[PDB]
UniProtKB/Swiss-Prot annotation:
GO terms for cellular component: axon; caveola; cell body fiber; cytoplasmic vesicle; dendrite; dendritic shaft; G protein-coupled serotonin receptor complex; glutamatergic synapse. Changing S157A: Decreased ability to bind serotonin and psilocybin. It is found in: Cell membrane; Cell projection, Dendrite; Cell projection, Axon; Cytoplasmic vesicle. The lineage of its organism: Eukaryota, Metazoa, Chordata, Craniata, Vertebrata. Binds lysergic acid diethylamine (LSD) in the orthosteric pocket. Bound LSD dissociates extremely slowly, with a residence time of about 221 minutes at 37 degrees Celsius. It comes from the Eukaryota. Residues 56-64, 134-150, 216-223 are extracellular. The gene is HTR2A. G-protein coupled receptor for 5-hydroxytryptamine (serotonin). Also functions as a receptor for various drugs and psychoactive substances, including mescaline, psilocybin, 1-(2,5-dimethoxy-4-iodophenyl)-2-aminopropane (DOI) and lysergic acid diethylamide (LSD). Ligand binding causes a conformation change that triggers signaling via guanine nucleotide-binding proteins (G proteins) and modulates the activity of downstream effectors. Signal peptide: none annotated. This is 5-hydroxytryptamine receptor 2A. A motif (DRY motif) lies at residues 90-92.
Amino acid sequence: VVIILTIAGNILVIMAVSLEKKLQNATNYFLMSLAIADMLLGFLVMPVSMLTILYGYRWPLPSKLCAVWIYLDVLFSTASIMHLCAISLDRYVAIQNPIHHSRFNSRTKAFLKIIAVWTISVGISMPIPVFGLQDDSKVFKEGSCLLADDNFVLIGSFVSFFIPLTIMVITYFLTIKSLQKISNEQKACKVLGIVFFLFVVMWCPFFITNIMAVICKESCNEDVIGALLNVFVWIGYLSSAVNPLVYTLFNKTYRSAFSRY
Ligand SMILES: C#CCOc1ccccc1CNCCc1cc(OC)c(N(C)C)cc1OC
């Protein structure tokens, strides 16, 4: 059911930009690209995880395909985090300095920000396909599909998520501070706050459990950590479905487009 919503919401978002040409602004191209990453993640990755859940957490799929699956789950997931990080940076720049942002608000730089995000997503996720496909034990370890290089993993989870997280946590808070510096401004503070709170609460638990697992493997119980990771990956996947409904709620035209289709 999470997979259905995750696919469907992004599918509606991507068409609504095309079917309704009013949302041809530069921002909604970023928003449709984030929807693309989320829908791709829902289509390619998540039913496989549901299948492993049914089959007992053993990888029925061909052996080397396990290597690319994890790679997809890094690239599509890292892209969404980088999309939201760039959204936070650009929206903070818009709030703090609205006039000067309009001078450089041309779409030509907006496309460079897209190429930057989708380039950094590949740059972060380079090792997993080539290394995992070469050595099964690196990414197929324990008989269940899992990425198992501690040295690479603990830094990779950090740069991919925490570095955007501090950029989000230092920009979002500052965006509220700019609004504070009446009713028009303060209404944005709460709506920004809920969006920040959900994605932090839904993304962060997986990563802290992963880093806690790698560091504390000597001093922790494996089974509880495994169950927690099994559920927290689902919650992180729900993070993908979350954003289209947020789009539906605050914007008039997306709501009309989804009501029609
Ligand atoms: C958005 C979204 C997807 O949902 C989410 C959302 C948040 C957390 C987890 C999930 C579940 N996806 C897991 C993806 C993933 C990302 C990684 O960092 C970028 C890494 N490491 C570098 C260790 C491993 C990994 O799992 C293979």
